[model samples]
Target: GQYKLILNGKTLKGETTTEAVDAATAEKVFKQYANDNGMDGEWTYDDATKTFTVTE
Candidate 1:
């Protein structure tokens, strides 16, 4: 099964900016959050689309 982040438990999606940030920093944050919550997935970013993708 797969899960997507939402602002509230009932919502379908959350807010995210389309700005570029430090890739390393973002990766670190994502890893930490996933690890702490026991989330099993891979987080990836596409520069062309400026979006994040999570795969399990």
Candidate 2:
């Protein structure tokens, strides 16, 4: 696990976006991100397509 401070000199909280390698990886990464940012979100993974869905 790694951490980034997002030093773009901006205060865009919910407006920030990023890309992930794959759905599984995205799910894991986003979970960490939410935890770090003190967010309350839920996630689900599809085994067949390997996709992740998130809801807040």
Candidate 3:
């Protein structure tokens, strides 16, 4: 059981087995991207794909 990441239309990397670890990776990615890009928005999770996404 792994969780993947997708931002906008592009696929990002942050693969992990446990949901807690995977969620931590997601939080890291979100804060990093937001700070780097100077933008902020929302977070989303999809059980079907076991993936996360952040978008404006």
Candidate 4:
């Protein structure tokens, strides 16, 4: 299994396989993006596409 992260419609690289690892990495990167930009929002996981989308 594999996963992808999408932030505001933009696809990101890295983080895949094993929900434990992939999901964790997704939050890690998502947090960084939110922190670095001081943005407010949450992320959603799409089981159909095995992808995560972060938005406000």
Candidate 5:
């Protein structure tokens, strides 16, 4: 995989409830994560992959 997502030490899992995504159909999965954790941030997409990370 071109992308790897890790939080704490565990990798993130997908589609317990929603559709799965790749670098294309995905945006800032991190932001939804932030709000879920009582945090907030903007997205920073890496143009080479169009995958995103977060910024507070």
Candidate 6:
């Protein structure tokens, strides 16, 4: 079963046990979030493991 996704305690939408609709969608969202929030880093999501990684 897939669980909810949270970043900084804020839940991400379109995530579930189904597929990368969550991961895929979150990919772009994270980029936008980073740019909008002035965050200097790169974010990557691994659909195979359902994991998100961030690097400065």
TM-score of each: 0.49, 0.41, 0.44, 0.49, 0.40, 0.45
Whole-model lDDT, candidate 1? 0.45
TM-score of 5: 0.40
The residue-by-residue lDDT of candidate 1 on 1-56, one tens digit each, is 12222222122225333222555555555555555655566566654554454445
Compared with the true structure, all predictions reach lDDT values of 0.45, 0.47, 0.58, 0.60, 0.44, 0.48
Q: Find the candidate with the highest lDDT and give its number.
A: 4
**Alpha-carbon deviation at 31 in model 5, angstroms:** 2.7
CA RMSD, predictions in order? 7.7, 8.4, 5.2, 5.1, 6.7, 6.4
Candidate 3 collision pairs = none
Q: Which stretches of candidate 6 lie over 4 Å from their true place?
A: 1-22
> Which digits, one per residue and each the tens of the lDDT, describe model 4 over residues 3-50?
666656233334433333566675676567656766565678886877
| Candidate 6 structure, TM-score to reference | 0.45
Query: Could you give me the TM-score of model 3 versus the true structure?
Result: 0.44
Error of 1 at 8 (Å): 15
Provide the clash count, candidate 5.
Answer: 0
> What is candidate 3's lDDT per residue for 1-56, written digit by digit as tens?
46655555233433333344566675676557655766555777887777766665
Error of 3 at 37 (Å): 1.5
Provide the lowest-lDDT 10-residue window in model 2.
1-10
The TM-score ranking, best first, is 4, 1, 6, 3, 2, 5
Residue pairs in collision within model 5: none
Misplaced by over 4 Å in model 5 are 1-20, 49-51
